[PDB]
Design a protein around this ligand. Structure first.
Ligand SMILES: [Mg+2]
Ligand SMILES: [Mg+2]
Ligand SMILES: [Mg+2]
Ligand SMILES: [Mg+2]
Ligand SMILES: [Mg+2]
Ligand SMILES: [Mg+2]
Ligand SMILES: [Mg+2]
Ligand SMILES: [Mg+2]
Ligand SMILES: [Mg+2]
Ligand SMILES: [Mg+2]
Ligand SMILES: [Mg+2]
Ligand SMILES: [Mg+2]
Ligand SMILES: [Mg+2]
Ligand SMILES: [Mg+2]
Ligand SMILES: [Mg+2]
Ligand SMILES: [Mg+2]
Ligand SMILES: [Mg+2]
Ligand SMILES: [Mg+2]
Ligand SMILES: [Mg+2]
Ligand SMILES: [Mg+2]
Ligand SMILES: [Mg+2]
Ligand SMILES: [Mg+2]
Ligand SMILES: [Mg+2]
Ligand SMILES: [Mg+2]
Ligand SMILES: [Mg+2]
Ligand SMILES: [Mg+2]
Ligand SMILES: [Mg+2]
Ligand SMILES: [Mg+2]
Length: 206
RNA sequence: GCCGCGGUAAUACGGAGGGCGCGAGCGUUACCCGGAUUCACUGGGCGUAAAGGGCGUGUAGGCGGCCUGGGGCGUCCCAUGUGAAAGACCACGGCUCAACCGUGGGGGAGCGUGGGAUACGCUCAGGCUAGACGGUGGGAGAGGGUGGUGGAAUUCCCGGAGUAGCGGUGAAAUGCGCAGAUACCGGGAGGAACGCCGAUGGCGAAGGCAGCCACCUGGUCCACCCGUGACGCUGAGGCGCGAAAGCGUGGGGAGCAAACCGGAUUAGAUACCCGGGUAGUCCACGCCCUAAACGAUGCGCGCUAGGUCUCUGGGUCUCCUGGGGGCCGAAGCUAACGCGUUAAGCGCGCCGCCUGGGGAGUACGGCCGCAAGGCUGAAACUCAAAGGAAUUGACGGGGGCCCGCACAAGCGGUGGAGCAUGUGGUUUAAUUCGAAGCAACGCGAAGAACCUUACCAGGCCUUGACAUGCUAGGGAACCCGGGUGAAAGCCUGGGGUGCCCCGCGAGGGGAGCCCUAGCACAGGUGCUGCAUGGCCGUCGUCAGCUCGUGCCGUGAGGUGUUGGGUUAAGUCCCGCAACGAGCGCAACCCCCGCCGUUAGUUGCCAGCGGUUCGGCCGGGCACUCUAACGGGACUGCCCGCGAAAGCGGGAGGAAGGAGGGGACGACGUCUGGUCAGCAUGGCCCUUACGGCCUGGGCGACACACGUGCUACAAUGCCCACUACAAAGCGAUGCCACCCGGCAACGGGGAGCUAAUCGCAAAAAGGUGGGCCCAGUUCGGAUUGGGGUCUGCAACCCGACCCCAUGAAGCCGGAAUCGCUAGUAAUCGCGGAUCAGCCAUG
């Protein structure tokens, strides 16, 4: 057990807060809680799309919600009827009355959370783990970026023994509180147990 | 069949499905050949894996230089006879094919006879000298045997001199000394070995061999080319030689020393250590014959780079030529290590020997011995190995280097006591569960009176305290009373249905919902963290772990990452078949150090006038502070050591060589922790391992330990007065101020959503004074009694106030802990959880 979360270790600099807004004292908790709820819905729904991150800004009964996807068309929908149900379904949950934006992902092949879920899926589809991995890695590696690295839990293949798979190219400096490394964790339910998927992606500098 | 497969995911057991193979057959068992170059003629081996005979002498035998000529045995060639048939090969043919059978055809090694060749081998004769042996002359030598002399030292005896201890050991003791030892001087007897030279050397067939001297004797090397003329190399059997030990007869016996006698160490010592002591070690003759008898490498001969050191002879002599010993190395060899003209290379001759480990060098037979034993030397059985060299790593009571409060130096403490808190044991109806060496034990639990709580008893509910959905039925939302009850819950009573569609309307249908019943199912802190994610601990904040390309190597891998130096560091320098790069190290980030800019409802007579002199008001942002940005140390500067890095010192400076401290914890280790945070695979429970409730339990003890607090006192303790802080906290809260009460605190009550109100006095400190060394104005436990507050409730189990009681305790056994600075020690204040609170954490 080691290696702090590269994100939170960088929250001060090269990386920000998924929920930026103020309050406190007697609202925070209630308000904060409110966030887990949305993120709750957006995640169980906009999956097949590529939920990458969920920014949530606030200014008193006026939330933001800016879902990050790779295939925004799925979030949107036919002509945009589904961004009507979600946007509306979100209210039946929070009467705060908020909007909902959707920013496409510039080559999801560079979004940790995605580079992982990608892998995740493959695993659940019973795909050689060692490959999906080496595969994903090269992808990132091959789509710009100066460094990538994917890690997969144990039971790789339903092995009776809890193993670990590696693979990783370029530079990936988790200690350099400046590097600006994207992180992401994909869980992998499976007939033989649960497998965790970690993906780091290193982009430029500042 | 070999390797193995099965201990709760088995492609290796059993069945199913499927699939491959082969098909009137397919498997099996046994035996022969093959694979097996694993008896090797074709086609192997012996330095370390199994394998060189301990050495020599030499018999049978095998092998044999150069030239010419006879034979022409081998050998080769031609002819021919034989080589029946069947089978085999081939062509053709018959039974519808084939199998099977018929016809014809081919070849055959060997052997007989005839003829031919004559290179090579055999034989014969003749001749030579390049092998070998002899001769001439020279050299070195611990080669051997015989006799004899020499000095040192040791022990024993005699004399002198001289004491009280000597000797011995990790310490000791036995032992020896006042019948005087040891230690010193002199003299005498005896045995054994033989210093320095001496060596990395010599000689010998091996074993083995060193004081010197003489004598008898072996071998050997060189120079000369003088003599013989192939006379040669090997060598089964035989014979002889053969360390030490042991054996026989006899002598000798100084020292040493099996056995044995005591001493000591040890849990026990028939052992390592110590003091004695026999065989023995010694010599003679006789016997034994083994050995890591090792170069672990048979003998001889020819051939294939060098260099370097060394012994010995010749030499036109620090150069070349011969013999011997070592080192390093060409080609080559080798599994590698390594070997390499002192080959483990290239070749030829001959000899010995191996053919998996264990059983066995054992059993039996035989030969040999005085005996101990020796040489020759199996199998049954059994196991899949035994094994060799080298690579990585780990480990060592191995070594060099080197870090960390790791040790030491030092300060305070723990182990003693009272208490607090955790843990074990005891125990209990239950005292829920986990954590266990460091890396469990005030740890999860930043808060157990109920709740929490998962345990225990008792009462009680079952689609349930929770999620989506189905079938039949009544009524449906929901709100308010009553009875039994500890509560839960069970039983039960009355207000009250609208919502959409169709219908004059009664009324019917139908959506969200409630309830009985059946169902899918909830739920489970119920096992498994050796099925897992997740997160954490830990070696380690240690300085390391790797990758690419190239190079080395059959290969595993090595090289770079080692080496010298430097560093907090695989940090940096220089070197180097490596050149780089990644993860880590560093830097980036935060807080504290000086400074500036920005901003002043913080702050100040600092500058000014008014004052209820409390900066209160005017006013001003200077200073303080506030919080943002930014500057600033880089060994940059000077001296000096160094190749360089880097190191010592100095200067300016708030700050110096990473300015202090954070945050940050590599590839990996441990089947490390957690299925009780959460997640999830499998197993298990579903009138119950589900759920509610009250009460109890998680809080007991006569015990032990851990982590703590408070002390045992006057470098103190009590009272009065009075001074300086930081960091946090506060609406369903912090509470100034007054009165009340000794007080806890109650009642009234202002300000504050808070740099500019409150929690707050900070305490140690300072000032006056008291106590006066005593269990004492030290210590506060325990207990009695009263009382306040929180909370529905404080018996089991709260905190607090007041009086009374005032205990253990006079500084802690073995052992053990933290800390290198603003740290340790010491003194308070704050917060999280939290009604309150056992926080001395
Ligand atoms: Mg054969
Ligand atoms: Mg062989
Ligand atoms: Mg001849
Ligand atoms: Mg003939
Ligand atoms: Mg015939
Ligand atoms: Mg002749
Ligand atoms: Mg002689
Ligand atoms: Mg001979
Ligand atoms: Mg003898
Ligand atoms: Mg004798
Ligand atoms: Mg004697
Ligand atoms: Mg051998
Ligand atoms: Mg000469
Ligand atoms: Mg020589
Ligand atoms: Mg060599
Ligand atoms: Mg070579
Ligand atoms: Mg023997
Ligand atoms: Mg016998
Ligand atoms: Mg051996
Ligand atoms: Mg070995
Ligand atoms: Mg230190
Ligand atoms: Mg010490
Ligand atoms: Mg104690
Ligand atoms: Mg330095
Ligand atoms: Mg370091
Ligand atoms: Mg760092
Ligand atoms: Mg375990
Ligand atoms: Mg407890």
């Amino acid at each position: 057990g080691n290696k702090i979360h590269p994100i939170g270790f960088r929250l001060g600099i090269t990386r920000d807060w998924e929920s930026r807004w103020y309050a406190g004292k007697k609202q925070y908790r209630h308000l904060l809680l409110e966030d887990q709820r949305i993120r709750g819905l957006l995640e169980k729904e906009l999956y097949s799309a590529g939920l990458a991150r969920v920014d949530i800004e606030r200014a008193a009964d006026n939330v933001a919600v800016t879902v990050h996807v790779a295939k925004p068309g799925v979030v949107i929908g036919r002509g945009g009827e589904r961004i009507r149900v979600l946007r509306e379904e979100l209210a039946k949950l929070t009467g705060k009355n908020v909007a909902l934006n959707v920013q496409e992902v510039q080559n999801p092949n560079l979004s940790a959370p995605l580079v992982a879920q990608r892998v995740a899926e493959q695993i659940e589809r019973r795909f050689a783990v060692r490959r999906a991995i080496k595969q994903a890695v090269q992808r990132v590696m091959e789509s710009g970026a100066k460094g990538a690295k994917v890690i997969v839990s144990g039971r790789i293949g339903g092995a009776e023994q809890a193993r670990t798979e590696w693979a990783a190219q370029g530079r990936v400096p988790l200690h350099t509180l400046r590097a600006n490394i994207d992180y992401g964790f994909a869980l992998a339910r499976t007939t033989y147990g649960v497998l965790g998927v970690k993906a780091y992606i290193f982009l430029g500098e500042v």
